[PDB]
């Protein structure tokens, strides 16, 4: 039943797989100190670069100290092996009710009251990160890493450390759904405003129930459109003018012209 544990006995791994990605497999686990189930994520160490492995360790140490209602709890991390696999284990608060991505798939639309409340919570989570000293920039905010505490619960932003694997400047294979990112992030030249861009694109997806830029077949075509100011076609499908305006001011090409988080939280839309 237990197929691993942390060196101090505090966390146990079950052989119950609950997510997967290029770099990770996620298992259900247990905090024996509290009795609460946790997520036990195994990062494939051999795929990482030296600088990524260094970064992950530094970021995991700052992560352990963070606490905010709209950020997924990060408990700890260490190096582990099992048979021929070395990994970095990360233990986080278990999220059982899906993500914004799963919500949209299942329920088809997000009603505006829900959009308003959950977007407000995402902005509080980001304001919290950006006001840490020094600021934490998420860098990889998306619908699939904004977790819900229940189908009518609150949202919590997750994967803050995993964002250090975003590999924004890498060549990548043309397979699966091509992705966009903020124009400056292609060159790795970010600040807080990259999270505003990403927030805007998340809101657009919430408002339209589609991933932006589906008209493009690959990430190069997306790159050409994003770095020349061309909006995703789904922008024109946002039915509510107020919601469309907010998106528009978040997803500006030039980072210095985007909304600030303060100005979003102060916007009429958000009380």
The residues that bridge with 4 in the sheet, in sequence order, are 13
Contact (Cβ atoms closer than 8 angstroms) between residue 160 and residue 186: no
User: Among all residues, which ones are annotated catalytic?
Assistant: 159
Query: Where do the structural domains in the chain lie, given as residue ranges?
Result: 1-93, 94-271
Which candidate, 73, 90, 83, 65, places its Cα nearest to that of 13? Answer: 90
1-93 maps to which CATH number?
3.30.200.20
**Listed resolution, Å:** 1.8
Q: Is 94 labeled as ligand-binding?
A: yes
Does 93 count as an annotated binding residue? yes
DSSP 228: T
Q: Is 142 annotated as a binding residue?
A: yes
What is the spatial distance between Cα 41 and Cα 223, in angstroms, rounded to a whole number?
31
Strands 85-93 vs 155-157: parallel, antiparallel or unpaired: unpaired
Residues recorded for the chain: 271
Query: In the structure encoding, which two tokens stand for residue 110, read together?
Result: 């997000």
- Which residue from 180, 252, 161 is spatially nearest to 219, judged by alpha carbons? 180
Report residue 160 as tokens: 């803050």
Closest of 163, 165, 195, 159 to residue 74, by C-alpha: 159
Three-state SS at 143: helix
And the tokens for 10? 């505090």
Residues 6+ positions from 212 with CB-CB distance below 8 Å:
180, 201, 204, 205, 232, 234, 235
CB contact set of 235 (below 8 Å; sequence gap of 6+): 204, 212, 244, 247, 248, 251
Beta-carbon contacts of 78 under 8 Å, excluding residues fewer than 6 positions away, are: 6, 7, 88, 89
Between helix 241-250 and helix 193-208 the angle, nearest 10°, is: 150
Q: What six digits make up the tokens of 3?
A: 């197929």
Annotated ligand binding at 74? The verdict is yes
Superfamily of domain 94-271: Transferase(Phosphotransferase) domain 1 (1.10.510.10)
Cα distance between residue 199 and residue 204, in whole Å: 9
Answer yes or no: are the C-beta atoms of 104 and 115 closer than 8 Å. Answer: no
Work out the angle at residue 270's Cα, subtended by the Cα atoms of residues 268 and 271, and round it to the nearest 5 degrees.
70
Asked whether residue 227 is marked as a ligand-binding residue, the answer is no
269 membership: H or E segment, kind and range: none
Residue 43 counted as an annotated binding residue:
no
């Amino acid at each position: 039943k237990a197929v691993g544990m942390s060196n101090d006995g505090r966390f146990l791994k079950f052989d119950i797989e609950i997510g997967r990605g290029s770099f990770k497999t996620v298992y259900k686990g247990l905090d024996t100190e509290t009795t609460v189930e946790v997520a036990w994520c195994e990062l494939q160490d051999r795929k990482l670069t030296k600088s990524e492995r260094q970064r992950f360790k530094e970021e995991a140490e700052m992560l352990k100290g963070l606490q905010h209602p709209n950020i997924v709890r990060f408990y700890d991390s260490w190096e582990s092996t099992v048979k021929g696999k070395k990994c970095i284990v990360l233990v986080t608060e278990l999220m059982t009710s899906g993500t914004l991505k799963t919500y949209l798939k299942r329920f088809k639309v997000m009603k505006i009251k829900v959009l308003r409340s959950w977007c407000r919570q995402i902005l509080k989570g980001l304001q919290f990160l950006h006001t840490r000293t020094p600021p934490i920039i998420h860098r990889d905010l998306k619908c699939d890493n904004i977790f819900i505490t229940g189908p009518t619960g609150s949202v919590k932003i997750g994967d803050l450390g995993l964002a250090t694997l975003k590999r924004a400047s890498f060549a990548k294979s043309v397979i699966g759904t091509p992705e966009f990112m903020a124009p400056e992030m292609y060159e790795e030249k970010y600040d807080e405003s990259v999270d505003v861009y990403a927030f805007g694109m998340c809101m657009l997806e919430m408002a339209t129930s589609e991933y932006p830029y589906s008209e493009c077949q690959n990430a190069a075509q997306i790159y050409r459109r994003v770095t020349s100011g061309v909006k995703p076609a789904s922008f024109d499908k946002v039915a509510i003018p107020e919601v469309k305006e907010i998106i528009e001011g978040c997803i500006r090409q030039n980072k210095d012209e985007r909304y600030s988080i303060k100005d979003l939280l102060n916007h009429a839309f958000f009380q």
